[PDB]
Design a binder for this molecule. Sequence first.
Ligand SMILES: O=P(O)(O)O[C@H]1[C@H](OP(=O)(O)O)[C@@H](OP(=O)(O)O)[C@H](OP(=O)(O)O)[C@@H](OP(=O)(O)O)[C@H]1OP(=O)(O)O
Lengths: 220, 220, 220, 220, 220
Amino acid sequence: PIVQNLQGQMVHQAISPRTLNAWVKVVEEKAFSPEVIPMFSALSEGATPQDLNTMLNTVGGHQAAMQMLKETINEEAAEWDRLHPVHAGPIAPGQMREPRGSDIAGTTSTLQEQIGWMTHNPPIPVGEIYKRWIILGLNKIVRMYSPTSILDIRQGPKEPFRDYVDRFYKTLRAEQASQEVKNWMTETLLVQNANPDCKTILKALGPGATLEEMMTACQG
Amino acid sequence: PIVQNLQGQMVHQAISPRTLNAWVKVVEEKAFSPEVIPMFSALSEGATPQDLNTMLNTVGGHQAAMQMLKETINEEAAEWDRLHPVHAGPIAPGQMREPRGSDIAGTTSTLQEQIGWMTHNPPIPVGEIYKRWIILGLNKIVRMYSPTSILDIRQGPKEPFRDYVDRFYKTLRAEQASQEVKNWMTETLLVQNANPDCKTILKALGPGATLEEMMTACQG
Amino acid sequence: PIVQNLQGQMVHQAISPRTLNAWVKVVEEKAFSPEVIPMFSALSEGATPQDLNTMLNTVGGHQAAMQMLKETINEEAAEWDRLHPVHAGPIAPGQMREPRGSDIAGTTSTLQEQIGWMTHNPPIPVGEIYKRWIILGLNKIVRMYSPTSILDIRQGPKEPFRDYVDRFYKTLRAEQASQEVKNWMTETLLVQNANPDCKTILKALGPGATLEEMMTACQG
Amino acid sequence: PIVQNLQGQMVHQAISPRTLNAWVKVVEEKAFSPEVIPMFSALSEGATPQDLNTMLNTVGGHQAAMQMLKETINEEAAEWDRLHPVHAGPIAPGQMREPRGSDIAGTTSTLQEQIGWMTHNPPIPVGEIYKRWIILGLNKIVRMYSPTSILDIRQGPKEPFRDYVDRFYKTLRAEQASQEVKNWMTETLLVQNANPDCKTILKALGPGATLEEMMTACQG
Amino acid sequence: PIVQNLQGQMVHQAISPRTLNAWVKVVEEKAFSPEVIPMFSALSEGATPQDLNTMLNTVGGHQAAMQMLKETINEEAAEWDRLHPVHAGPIAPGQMREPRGSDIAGTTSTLQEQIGWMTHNPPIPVGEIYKRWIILGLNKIVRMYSPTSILDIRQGPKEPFRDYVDRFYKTLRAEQASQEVKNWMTETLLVQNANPDCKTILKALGPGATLEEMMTACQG
Ligand SMILES: O=P(O)(O)O[C@H]1[C@H](OP(=O)(O)O)[C@@H](OP(=O)(O)O)[C@H](OP(=O)(O)O)[C@@H](OP(=O)(O)O)[C@H]1OP(=O)(O)O
């Protein structure tokens, strides 16, 4: 990827085989859990769009998600084209023209054009826009592979509350909603879907008590 | 992460995938035990807060611990905001203001801000403050993860004292207290809760005896 | 670890994850035995006391030996303080006084003090003294961890002498004693604790000889 | 003890019979409580070692503790001799040496020598050192006569908590541990060995509050 | 305490043995009566903080009261330190730094320093502040030691009015509340909790009857 040289300037480089192999194996091995979203951003920082496409195309199977993300990328490119008018006219060398809906995805842009965009002043974070589009695609993939919603989790009659709250938060991180709704649901559902002793302890503690005191007092 | 270059200035470096994989596997597989706390400082030396956040959020399972750590990070950010008042006025030329509560967590600051802060003169160890906050969170989560205290541990009559003193030290190191309190515990409770035969042998030997003669006294 | 640049100065560096991972794995899978003593000395060359204590604290399990070595380190630090002249008062500019008992253990002294001491003129081998203290602690630990003594081993009627002498030397190597008594005992009872047929064969060979002849005759 | 006189001169006061009678009666009434430590320091403040030794000799009964404190006073005299340079022979005019352990014990030093030491510039508070030795002796004696420890205090189901905490604080005051350890034990042991009803009341209230809030809720 | 000295500054004098004997006997006789509040002030007229500490440490029994008074002293000292300006930097002669929590408690300040504070210009009433703090502590401890509320006192048919009014007023003198609600209670409950005959007599007389008038009316 784009790696800074030893006490020098930024230079282009290819993706190391180890990183892409680790990415593809960790993607294919277990599942499309939400934890792939951070790890992806831990392996595709400062990378040109064509290398993103190369890393994307190496997935074994799960082509329905690939079609989903391709369609979302196409529609986002169309939205970008319609919102931002095309700047026509002569274009000076070194600072190329505005990228189009196909140039951002890198399907028509070449390596030299991407390097020029990266080194262009003012900076062009087209790779970052493609990365955030991939992030949205991964979010909707997690939505596709979500086993169930949050509105049906109920703690077992004798199940310890530790696993209950752990799986509740595991499902919560995969939910797609606003932050305020997430705060409201984590304040309400936790006390409304607990065992009688734990919920009586909760109501004795009253509102405004964080989960720390809740699950240190409900112990036993 | 952040590593100084040989015969050159410090330069930003991408995160090694092997380090992240080793961290996540060692966190997920063994336990939430104290020995992982030093290992963290081995794998987090000289890193931006974004690197620490990425390392933290890549763990699978145990999301209650992650929520607790996030809440403690938020409260420590509030503490930093209250101890250090928000300085208004224009930004000094080439001297960005001190990071805010949301800036140390990295949720509202771009990587360039931390890159500038690390190399700024005088240096700003905001990443070290975030690392210490994470260390405090790890300490409290490993405290709550300990299922048993040290005041109720008892030795069975039908097993050697080896594993009993082993688990006594496990519980002793899993609790956070003053060094003098730990010395008092390891001076009193190591002999006040042993098997009766070993207790009488050690009473005959008298106080002020090292652990080696204690274990070699009543072998078998 | 801190390393010297070729024809240059001495620059501090972090411990590579490979070394720590290998050390913890070999500690886990190769429960304390004499051959682990050299291994540590092969993985601690040019390492600061902070690195030594970090790799020491990463161990999992068998914390009784860890407390024993911590106590021996404390008592050796006290001996160093009481023997080596402790200087106080004014300190010459550009120089710092020798590390104290708490400084050699690394509990109080900061990493910068260790870096300055290592690069000082003349250099201070505080790290090597701490390493040799750890070596003595490991020696007494492996002495403690001896499954049995050395004068009680015998040879079964259906047991070939090969694994007999193998376990004999394995137990003998775990003995902390002078070399002369080791040679004296390895020349007399090694036959007295064997099977009668090869015993009488060796006795007919003559009192004392090179062990290659004594094993070739005992073959079959 | 020597008492300063207003608008006059520093004059030694003969030991009045009132103080001796009060001390002997307060010794004979209980003879075993931490209260001897303050009261003694109120009855012998600013007194020469001769007066301290006379008051020690006047009290009778329980000669085992008296012999123990006398032999420890002898060992303190020996350590005082050995820690400080033993002065001998002629002394410089207008100056006097630090009295030895035998001299400070009140056996080989007459009253006029004590008065001269007190009136010297700088003053020599040998009486204060002897008083501190006596205080340490009383502390270790009441340690030797403590009938019960602090980890075995169990409150009966019908036993009121007021007398329980009273005797608990009695034993804690009888304890000569560190101040921080005393704070830790007052924070933990008071609730670790409490009745289940008040234990649950305190758990609902929230650990970390004043003991007055504990007692106001543990009533009944 | 501090005795008046002519043609010179006042010099502190030790507490007389008879005064402390009277103090301890009046403590041991009742230990919870409100009449100890004046008796304490009559003995501590201008007493140094060291005398107050010694006389507070000479009371035997009910160590919970000592713990509560010590903790209230600590919190009041912290409040005094935080509210009163913290003197820092160059402390010129003629004044002194603010006594801290331990300094105002006399455990980290020599007696000569306290004497100089008492005779300072302007004088520092450290002893008076400690006296009022321990007076508040005594008030709250005697509130604790009062086991009966004021709304349940009733004059029984076989109970004479004299005993009823005497115990009512004696408990009122140990009650801590507003003066207006005190007046309301002493004008309502005294006629609401009497025998019916002189209840009707007092109702016929009307509110505003003195103790002598009501006691003569209820005679018979
Ligand atoms: O990090 P180091 O201890 O210096 O070892 C590195 C590391 O290999 P390992 O992670 O297996 O130790 C490199 O891999 P990356 O960290 O860059 O992913 C590898 O680079 P290659 O993957 O390109 O082989 C490099 O080898 P080289 O110096 O030949 O580039 C090798 O150094 P050593 O070969 O000296 O152990």
